[PDB]
Amino acid sequence: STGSATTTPIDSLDDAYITPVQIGTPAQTLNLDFDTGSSDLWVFSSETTASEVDGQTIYTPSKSTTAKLLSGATWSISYGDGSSSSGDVYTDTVSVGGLTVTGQAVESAKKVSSSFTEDSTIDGLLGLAFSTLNTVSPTQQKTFFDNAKASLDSPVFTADLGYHAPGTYNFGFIDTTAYTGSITYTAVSTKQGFWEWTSTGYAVGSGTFKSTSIDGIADTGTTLLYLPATVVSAYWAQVSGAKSSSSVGGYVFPCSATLPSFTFGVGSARIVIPGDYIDFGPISTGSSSCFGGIQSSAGIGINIFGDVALKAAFVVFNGATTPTLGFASK
């Protein structure tokens, strides 16, 4: 089997991407944030505290003839940005772009943090990291991909995120028309439960390539590119007037600037992030200070190849017995 679904930026900055997902019988369609950096499928629901729902579409398990309460199961997750949610668990039928999983754990939120409440466009998350990170207790549950894998034509999914435009998540096949040149595959460590890999280096604009190992995770649920402070300083040094602002929370730059590209290495291959992918616009409405899309990972504890990086590539998440990651230009 295969599945194919369009993923769409939630706003003009590509702050996140949402993908329609069918849950239950009859189908209830929710727009979920596909997150290769976590492993819970959770949704706003009829059980979510009323004051914490503001415009989201909710899952109502009582209206689904295939929903079953997973007795005694609860979940609670806290994300790297400080966001959180928690609740109980149903199993139900879940379909993505024509690919159907029966008995998928659908984690129903009773509580969500303010950041989720304030995001009216995101109805929940669909985790695509390794199932070892799933937070359901006392019986850990599998991700949608984990459940689908054996049925897929090939045990893979691909992320093709657009810049200020829609893109595609495919399951079970590699669309050879969706990228240019070849896909370069690179080793993955699953030891921390992430799609963790090691970039071979970087370049800033037309500068020389610096060969250096950068361990990080491929994370579709993180907006920006978080890299070591040395690398990030080298990038913003090429932007006149750019500086790190403790009050704003990272590097900012004059909105009148032209940003240089940023290249990262995948083995001997190179992925080029165009400069305008690194512009996240005024720090507040009407400001001439703009927020940068490349930020320091100091304090996070891990480097993160988020959407700023991934949207410059066609990315293969290869879930074979020894997982790997593939990157192609597009």
Ligand SMILES: N[C@H]1[C@H](O)[C@@H](Sc2ccccc2)[C@@H]2OC[C@H]1O2
């Ligand atoms: N793996 C990522 C996860 O999806 C988000 S949770 C989130 C919060 C608000 C809006 C959308 C998503 C959090 O920030 C980056 C990292 O942890």
